[PDB]
Amino acid sequence: GHMAVVYAARCKFGNPLVQNNRITRAVCDLTNEHTTKDGSWHYVEVDNECKYLAGDNPRDQPGWAVFVKYCTYYKGVPDA
């Protein structure tokens, strides 16, 4: 590949490297809702995925913990 690791959040459901865009859109919304004042999180279509601010590393932010709490509950695998 190319050494460009611009972060994007995705929540996969079962299938390898297969994000569920519907649930991820919902999870990212909920995440953004909770962590609005932390960072503007926004969902972008399946080429670009869920972007945190400009596509920064979400793991650092509490928003990621929110994304995780919802993905686990929804039985999905949160990646970023």
Distance between CA atoms of 76 and 13, rounded to whole angstroms? 5
Number of domains in the chain: 1
CB 56 within 8 A of CB 7: yes
Please tell me the number of Cα atoms within 13 Å of 43 on its side-chain side. Answer: 20
Q: Yes or no: say if 61 and 11 are a contact pair by the CB < 8 Å rule.
A: no
- Domain carrying residue 58: 1-80
What is the CB neighbour count within 10 angstroms for residue 74? 16
Alpha carbon separation from 14 to 46, 55, 66, 76 (Å, rounded) = 17, 24, 20, 7
CA 67 to CA 65: how far, in whole Å?
5
Nearest alpha-carbon partner for 68 in 38, 37, 24:
24
Measure the CA–CA gap between 62 and 4, rounded to whole angstroms. Answer: 24
Rounded Cα distance between 4 and 34, Å, is 29
- Give the whole-angstrom CA distance, residue 42 versus residue 23: 14
